[PDB]
Paper text:
For decades, the house dust mite has been known as a major causative agent of various allergic diseases including asthma, atopic dermatitis (AD) and allergic rhinitis. Here, we report the crystal structure of Der f 7 that shows an elongated and curved molecule consisting of two anti-parallel β-sheets – one 4-stranded and the other 5-stranded – that wrap around a long C-terminal helix. In Der f 7, Leu48 and Phe50 are in close proximity to Asp159, explaining why monoclonal antibody binding to Leu48 and Phe50 can inhibit IgE binding to Asp159. Both Der f 7 and Der p 7 bind weakly to polymyxin B via a similar binding site that is formed by the N-terminal helix, the 4-stranded β-sheet and the C-terminal helix.
We purified a Der f 7 construct (Asp1 to Asn196) and determined its crystal structure by molecular replacement method. The model of Der f 7 was refined up to a resolution of 2.0Å with R-factor of 0.224 (Rfree  = 0.28). The electron density for the N-terminal residues from Asp1 to Tyr5 and the C-terminus residue Asn196 were disordered and these residues were not included in the model. In the crystal structure of Der f 7, the 11 β-strands are arranged to form an elongated, curved anti-parallel β-sheet that wraps around the long C-terminal helix, α2; this is compared with the 10 β-strands in Der p 7. The N-terminal helix, α1, interacts closely with the 4-stranded β-sheet and the C-terminal end of the helix α2 to form a hydrophobic channel, likely for ligand binding. The ExPASy predicted isoelectric points of Der f 7 and Der p 7 as 4.90 and 4.85, respectively. Superposition of Der f 7 and Der p 7 showed that, with the exception of the N- and C-termini, the only region that is not structurally equivalent lies at the loop between β1 and β2, which harbors the largest conformational difference between these two proteins. Notably, this loop contains the linear epitope residues, Leu48 and Phe50, for the mAb HD12 that was found to inhibit IgE binding to Der f 7; these mAb epitope residues are unique to Der f 7 and found to be replaced with Ile48 and Leu50 in Der p 7. The putative IgE epitope residue of Der f 7 and Der p 7, Asp159, is located at the start of helix α2 and in proximity of the β1–β2 loop. In Der f 7, Asp159 is located closely to the β1–β2 loop with a distance of only 7.7Å between Asp159 OD1 and Phe50 CZ.
Author numbering:
A (entry chain B), B (entry chain A): 6 to 195
Amino acid sequence: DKITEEINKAIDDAIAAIEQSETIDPMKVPDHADKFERHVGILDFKGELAMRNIEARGLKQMKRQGDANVKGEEGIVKAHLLIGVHDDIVSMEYDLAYKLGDLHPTTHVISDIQDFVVALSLEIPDEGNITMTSFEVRQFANVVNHIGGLSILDPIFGVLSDVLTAIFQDTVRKEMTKVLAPAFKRELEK
Amino acid sequence: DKITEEINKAIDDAIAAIEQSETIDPMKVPDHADKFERHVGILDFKGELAMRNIEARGLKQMKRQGDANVKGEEGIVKAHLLIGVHDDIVSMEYDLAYKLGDLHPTTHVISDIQDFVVALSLEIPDEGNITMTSFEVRQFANVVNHIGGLSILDPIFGVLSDVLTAIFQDTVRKEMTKVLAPAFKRELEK
């Protein structure tokens, strides 16, 4: 209970420190190119896309999703925690170029990452270096792709949207993990 | 986008209708007993437990996590939705009897289900009747078990907590889906 309290405090303080530094909102994400192919009822959509100027906004709203899950295990405390965003979606903004045959338009897009959650684990020996032991951005359960000037009924939208989501689940999630993990680790492990 | 706003609104209306239902909050969960075995190390824990008077609270705070994820595919509008709880946890209370050796205490516990979320899918033909084509209570990302009278440092805590968490992931999730899924289906399908 006192231990739960102080772990909660370590986490909140680390969150505050990270939010304070800026660095994290907006967060830059490296460009990413990908190739797509889908057959959709007598129609074929095969081509290529490029995302540039990708920025994640909203992590300034990060907050603990509740008490730490804590168990004393043989003279070492083990804690597991959720940090999500609170007062927003996490918003991804970027320029999109794609190619389909002779068409190669560009537009801008906002992608909504719903229920962004970081799961992290800690360890505390009776003395006494708090060690962060795992850090992961959970799988995005729902991503909404607002592709500038593209109607959602346009058969190509569904193709582009599904590809962008897969890219977010794979490429972008792992990049966000690579940025967030050392930041929390330096704050916690002090 | 109007189609999205329409789908959002149907979801918002169904949530409101379901939130007033009763049997939703508090929701009863059938009694459950489990014979468990956990290996921690050197020590080894075989035993049994029984949960009774299980009640889930907080579902009256259900709310969409953002826009419906919407796209047209082959003349069908397809929508994917995330519904969580806003300004609350989902909290489970219950009586707990457990047995380890002829240790056989009884107590009461509060379990915190963090980031409780339901994901659902809809299809909307212009033909055409709206069907809910999927519904899932997502894996709980973190559960905090507050077991009356029992210290987080007590070696028996970690064991019961882990067993209770597995029961939540399996039995409790299934039981909540049993209540929620046909309630949403009924609302959304007329």
